[PDB]
Amino acid sequence: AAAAGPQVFDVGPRYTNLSYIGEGAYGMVCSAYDNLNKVRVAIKKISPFEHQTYCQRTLREIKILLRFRHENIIGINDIIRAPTIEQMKDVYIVQDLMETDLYKLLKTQHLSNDHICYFLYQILRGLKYIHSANVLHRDLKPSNLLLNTTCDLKICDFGLARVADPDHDHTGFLTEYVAERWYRAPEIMLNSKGYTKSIDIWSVGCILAEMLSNRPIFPGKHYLDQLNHILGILGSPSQEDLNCIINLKARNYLLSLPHKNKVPWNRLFPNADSKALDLLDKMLTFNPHKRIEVEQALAHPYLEQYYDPSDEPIAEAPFKFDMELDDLPKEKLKELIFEETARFQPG
């Protein structure tokens, strides 16, 4: 078995000339030469079978990525695992090699207006598909946007993704949340489980702001600070938008805060295209009901060079029902992962 930083990175006959390209969630990532397609590929080694949580996120990601087929969503090209459940301790996911991600790129590179526009278009084109499958990504952020050397953009990391469930979106004030703090919609901190499509549009809005300035727009240091950051730019919510928050504890928290006026986007982003700021405004709308939808965003004048709804496909096979994964034991989840990965076996 081939070794790297040894641990075991055992990827069969097909994949050779391994190079460590960092750590991931439940294992390590290497590039490799695909001896069959004659290209360098990315391979992620995953070891989740000890933890119900790691199993759930792995199964969710595999089920979604295998069902989805879209230019702006990372595909699974292969999955390497032992031929039996008993021998399966690890799973290797083979994906297109993407040389960087928007997180890494924004560390050092200034984006041209043309790059910002093309990246935003591709994010929303991928997100249109995701949402058309009745799926929410729920963890959109620069590190989950992969880029290759020709600036093709692919959304990745569906470990926190859920089937949309607007009916069951309500929760109490200060409900604990998993997805990265700085990209969370205001309603997550107030009264939302993040089970509606509008939470993903907020994250895209945050990413657009970050592309315009190379710094996170709402770098909250703590759960409620995320909201003070948002209201420090957007200003105090309107009476109308408060009237939409019926949770008394969430509404009274907002009422307790001193009045804050809106900071104009052109003051924050003086170098920005005016059309980009108009669209930013509509994505970073406090009220999730008034927030722009993905298809409206694609149709915005900022994106007019790219917009072509005939070339913006939707999903053939939406997830119509909850994937009831939350209270399945590890052992069943391992069986489902085994079954889900069976198509890639010589077998």
Curated annotation (Swiss-Prot):
One of its GO terms (molecular function) is ATP binding. Disulfide bonds: none annotated. Its cofactor is Mg(2+). One of its GO terms (biological process) is positive regulation of DNA-templated transcription. A motif (TXY) lies at residues 175-177. Signal peptide: none annotated. This is Mitogen-activated protein kinase 1. It comes from Rattus norvegicus. The lineage of its organism: Eukaryota, Metazoa, Chordata, Craniata, Vertebrata.
